[PDB]
Amino acid sequence: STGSATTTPIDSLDDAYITPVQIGTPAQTLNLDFDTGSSDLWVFSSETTASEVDGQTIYTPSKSTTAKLLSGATWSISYGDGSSSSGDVYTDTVSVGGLTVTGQAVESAKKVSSSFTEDSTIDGLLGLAFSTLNTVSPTQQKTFFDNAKASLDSPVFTADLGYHAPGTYNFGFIDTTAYTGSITYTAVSTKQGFWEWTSTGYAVGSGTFKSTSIDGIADTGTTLLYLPATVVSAYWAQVSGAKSSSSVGGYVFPCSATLPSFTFGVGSARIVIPGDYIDFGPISTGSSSCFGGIQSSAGIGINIFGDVALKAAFVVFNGATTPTLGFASK
């Protein structure tokens, strides 16, 4: 089997991407944030504290003939930005782009933090990291991909995120029309539960390539590219007026600037992130200070190849017995 679904930026900055997901019988379609950096499929629901719901579409298990309470199961998760959610668990039928999993754990939110309440466009998250990170207790649950894998034509999914435009998540096949050149594959460590890999280096603009190992995670659920302070300083040093602002919370730059590209290595291959991709616009409405799309990972504990990086590539998440990651230009 295979599945194919369009993923759409939630706003003009590509702050995140939402993908329609069918849950239950008859189908209830919710727009979820596919997150390769976590392993819980959770949704706004009829159980979510009413004051914490603000425009989202909710899952109502009592209206689904295939929903079953997973008795005794609870979940609670915190993300890298300090956001959080928690609740109880149902199993139900979940379909993405024509690919159906029965008995998928659908984690129903009773509580969500303010940042989720404030994102009216995100009805929940669909985790695509390794199931070892799933937070359901006392019986850990499998991701949608993990449940689907054995039935897929090939045990893979691909992320093809657009810049200021829709893109595609495919399950079970590689669309050879969706990228240019060849796909370069690179080793993955699953020891921390992430799609963790080592980049072979970087370049800033037309500058020479610096060969250096950068260990990080491929995370579709993180907006920006978070890299070591040395690398990030080298990038922003090429932008007149750019500076790290503690009050704003990262590098900012004059909105009048033309940003250089940033290249990252994947083995001997190179993925080029155009300068425009690194512009996250005014820090506040009407400001001439703009927020940078490449930021230091120093306060995070891990480097993160988030959407800014991934949207410059066609990315293969290969879930074979020994997982790997593939990157192609497009």
Ligand SMILES: c1cc2c(cc1CNC1CCCC1)OCO2
């Ligand atoms: C918070 C934490 C997350 C997440 C999504 C959220 C929701 N607010 C984000 C801010 C920009 C838009 C989405 O996906 C993984 O970790």
